[PDB]
Design a protein around this ligand. Structure first.
Ligand SMILES: CCc1ccsc1-c1ccc(O)c(O)c1
Ligand SMILES: [Mn+2]
Ligand SMILES: [Mn+2]
Length: 261
């Protein structure tokens, strides 16, 4: 629950490595590349260069090192050597690294080639829904307020939030308490405290919120075939706000968010 300064430092390291996988893979995300190849590149980098390990491989039996979800695929897309990226594709790459016992959990959207109207819009709105949630994190606030704020913002755009999946406490365990819902729920009642580490990872559907799992047991798609986007950051709650542990160079939000004067 409450991380020690030394545990937080390990989180900073693990968080940076996860972020750097996403920075590293960027130039490869182009038309013609396979999702299977992107997965190999990520894994080779995590293992051989970061001297770390993917938390995703073998987790609940997951066959790959990273999750790669395209378009109407909501989450848990399986990297496949035959799956080639096309122009106009929106693509999420979700990475979780373990280094020195601690987890770093992050994802971003890439748009392949020329962005379509919906693609640009959904990805922009999804990141912003994460950003506004990030700006709310500080001691004393309830997670319900944060969930409600994401949902309100997303829905005001005419989009929907996926219910089945949520952010989560993170540390030595991939998934720890608390659950971080991206919508208002009567069972959410968690007051944020300094030292808490968790993820915020809104999945946003252009259309309806309902999802469907494929016959592979893994691939989750929107039920109405609409586009779906996701961004994720791992954070630590500080005394006066939060620090984003998985911040990248392409992030347009500061690493340290303070509400003190
Ligand atoms: C793909 C690994 C996996 C299996 C069941 S849930 C899950 C997963 C994937 C990405 C995440 O960010 C996460 O918190 C969990
Ligand atoms: Mn993730
Ligand atoms: Mn996660």
């Amino acid at each position: 629950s409450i991380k020690t300064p030394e545990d937080i430092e390990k989180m900073r390291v693990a968080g940076r490595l996860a972020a750097e996988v996403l920075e590293m893979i960027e130039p490869y995300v182009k038309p013609g590349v396979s999702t299977g190849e992107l997965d190999r590149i990520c894994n080779d980098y995590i293992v051989n260069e970061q001297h770390a390990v993917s938390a995703c491989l073998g987790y609940h039996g997951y066959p790959k090192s990273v999750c790669i979800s395209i378009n109407e695929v909501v989450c848990h897309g399986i990297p496949d050597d035959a799956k080639l990226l096309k122009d106009g594709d929106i693509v999420n790459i979700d990475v979780t690294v373990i280094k020195d016992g601690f987890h770093g959990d992050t994802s971003k959207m890439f748009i392949v080639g020329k962005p379509t109207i919906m693609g640009e819009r959904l990805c922009r709105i999804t990141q912003e829904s994460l950003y506004l949630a990030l700006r709310m994190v500080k001691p004393g606030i309830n997670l319900r307020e944060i969930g409600a704020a994401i949902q309100k913002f997303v829905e005001a755009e005419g989009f929907s939030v996926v219910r089945e999946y949520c952010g989560h406490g993170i540390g030595r365990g991939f998934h720890e308490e608390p659950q971080v819902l991206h919508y208002d729920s009567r069972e959410t009642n968690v007051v944020l405290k300094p030292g808490m580490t968790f993820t915020i990872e809104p999945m946003v559907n252009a259309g309806k919120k309902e999802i469907r799992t494929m016959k592979d047991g893994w691939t989750v798609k929107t039920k109405d075939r609409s586009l779906s986007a996701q961004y994720e950051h791992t954070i630590v709650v500080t005394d006066n706000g939060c620090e984003i542990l998985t911040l990248r160079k392409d992030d347009t939000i500061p690493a340290i968010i303070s509400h003190d004067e």
